[PDB]
Design a protein around this ligand. Sequence first.
Ligand SMILES: Cc1cn([C@H]2C[C@H](O)[C@@H](COP(=O)(O)NP(=O)(O)OP(=O)(O)O)O2)c(=O)[nH]c1=O
Ligand SMILES: [Mg+2]
Ligand SMILES: [Mg+2]
Length: 342
Amino acid sequence: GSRKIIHVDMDCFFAAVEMRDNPALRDIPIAIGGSRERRGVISTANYPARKFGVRSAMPTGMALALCPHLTLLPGRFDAYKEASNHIREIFSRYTSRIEPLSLDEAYLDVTDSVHCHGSATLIAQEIRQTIFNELQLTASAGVAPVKFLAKIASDMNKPNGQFVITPAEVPAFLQTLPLAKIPGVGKVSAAKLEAMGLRTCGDVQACDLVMLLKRFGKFGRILWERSQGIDERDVNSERLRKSVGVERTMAEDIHHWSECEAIIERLYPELERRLAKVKPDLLIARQGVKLKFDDFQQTTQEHVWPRLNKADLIATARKTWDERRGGRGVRLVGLHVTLLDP
DNA sequence: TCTAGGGTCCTAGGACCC
DNA sequence: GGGTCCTAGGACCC
Ligand SMILES: Cc1cn([C@H]2C[C@H](O)[C@@H](COP(=O)(O)NP(=O)(O)OP(=O)(O)O)O2)c(=O)[nH]c1=O
Ligand SMILES: [Mg+2]
Ligand SMILES: [Mg+2]
């Protein structure tokens, strides 16, 4: 009943692709992110950049203060998508039990594989190899009896390495495991738990499930379970995108409806183009808009609607602008579509 | 330094049903 | 009053 789960995760993904395609970027600090002037943030950075403290989700201003000679790149998403498609094709050779989580990551359930004598360690190392062949990119991997441990493990020995967690090692691994390493536990949750002296899975083990459930709910049950090493989430393989969105943050806050409208006129064709790729008839379940104000409060207004329609998006936007702006400047305008049910 | 843009899942009240 | 829809918002991941 104990499974064999692999998590595969490409190293410095976007940056890695950019270094392969331009070796002159190999030993200098580079990052993919928007410019400071455009209120950008770092999508990611190579190891030379990370040495300076540059991290994903860091505002570009801070990144440059930390690393003045940082070479900043706009991003080339078709290339990254090519790499992704390729590595998913590689995954398909060993199993059909594959759950992509993003361009550069995936779960594989190799519990019932005949490859590599059923050795998950060898399957994984062999998948890291041939990804380096064929693509000239490096991957890292985690091997564990369940999903979340495989995910934690893939991070343990990067870059270009893997880490294995056997059932026997699980209790010792968990006792020290800080709750923040658990996928789904972010800064807010971790801070809230750490307030009440809970730092590790060891602490949650000695904790009451009913207080945990009354306080956090479904999430609390999940925390308890993962703290016991319990994670029965199966690898899916049949997951479908549920929504499509296009938003933009402007270099300067806007204060006039005409500006918002102009933005939307530019946003719509991009949304139509991306929706058309999977939905040529543009039929949808809902559509709506998003505004984020200078106080960083964000509002969305969405409604049932049968087909992507620009005029309705503009009217909805105008109602939102007039009713919710409250004299504030607007830093972001967005359009959104909820895909049909099936 | 000054805070993206791509998304998923969960919560919560009211509508609606039964 | 529970189940499920609707809409709005937040936490989290990549
Ligand atoms: C975390 C993060 C990632 N990305 C992009 C760039 C990453 O290359 C790519 C993969 O995410 P990641 O695996 O979390 N970070 P990484 O792959 O670049 O570096 P590594 O996995 O730690 O080696 O997704 C963002 O655009 N914004 C982000 O906040
Ligand atoms: Mg990665
Ligand atoms: Mg990743």
